[PDB]
């Protein structure tokens, strides 16, 4: 399905900007297995970037496994041109960041990915910026997926949460991503600053 993303420019610092309170939480509900871990995320776009704010409720954080997706982490997938190919093209992105703000890329230039995290009582927050190469405008559609990897005190992933893909294959197949459609940018956006 489809998330409508409002226009806005947050500060990347792990703190919830006032402007994030004006957009709605998306609740990923595709669980690989039962778990008390849950998550939500918000999206925002500006002329240069897509923005993700994720919060994860997770009472045990573990990142001892050397395999990235076997640590408590969130992953962001983007099909920027909206090709919806069945395998990864040159414009497809798959990024990951753990609760300690350690980032990995499975696809795309990691120089585009800028993140901060914050430890919360019972969980963590990720605030992420992905620099866009195509100029977005109102009505732009991109493919998007969001995933949480939940690891336990055995230092292994025991569960996944997904927004859109229930098949375990977003890492391989962009056509499984959902859609985001960008709206809300003013056309004028001018006039003087009135004090
Ligand atoms: Ca912020
Ligand atoms: Ca693509
Ligand atoms: Ca965990």
Numbering used by the authors: 21 to 215
Quote the authors verbatim:
The hyperthermophilic bacterium Caldicellulosiruptor kristjansonii encodes an unusual enzyme, CkXyn10C-GE15A, which incorporates two catalytic domains, a xylanase and a glucuronoyl esterase, and five carbohydrate-binding modules (CBMs) from families 9 and 22. C. kristjansonii has been shown to grow on a variety of polysaccharides, including cellulose, xylan, starch, and pectin, with an optimal growth temperature of 78 °C. From the N-terminus, CkXyn10C-GE15A consists of two CBM22 domains (CBM22.1 and CBM22.2), a GH10 endo-xylanase (Xyn10C), three CBM9 domains (CBM9.1, CBM9.2, and CBM9.3), a GE from CE15 (GE15A), a cadherin domain, and two surface layer homology (SLH) domains believed to anchor the protein to the Gram-positive cell wall. Collectively, the results show that all five CBMs have their own distinct binding preferences and appear to complement each other and the catalytic domains in targeting complex cell wall polysaccharides. We have determined the structures of the third CBM9 domain (CBM9.3) and the glucuronoyl esterase (GE15A) by X-ray crystallography.
To gain a deeper insight into the molecular determinants for carbohydrate binding of CBM9.3, we determined the structure using X-ray crystallography. Residue numbers in this section reflect the numbering of the PDB file, where Lys21 corresponds to Lys1071 in the full-length CkGE15A-Xyn10C protein sequence. The putative sugar-binding site was easily identifiable from comparisons with TmCBM9-2, and in CBM9.3, it is formed by the aromatic residues Tyr89, located on α-helix 2 between β-strands 4 and 5, and Trp191, located on a loop between β-strand 11 and α-helix 4. These contrast the dual tryptophan residues forming the sugar-binding clamp in TmCBM9-2 (Trp71 and Trp175), though the ability of CBM9.3 to bind various carbohydrates suggests this does not have a negative effect on the carbohydrate recognition for the protein. CBM9.3 shows metal-binding sites for the three calcium ions similar to those of TmCBM9-2, although the calcium ion near the loop between β-strands 4 and 5 in CBM9.3 is present at only approximately 50% occupancy. Additionally, although the overall structure of CBM9.3 is very similar to that of TmCBM9-2, the binding site appears to be much more open in CBM9.3 compared to a pocketlike site in TmCBM9-2. In TmCBM9-2, the binding site is blocked at one end by Asn172, with the equivalently positioned residue in CBM9.3 being Gly188 that, due to its small size, does not enclose the binding site. The C-terminal linker region included in the construct is observed as an extended tail seen in CBM9.3. This tail closely interacts with the tail in a symmetry-related protein molecule, along with the protein surface near the tail of this symmetry-related protein molecule.
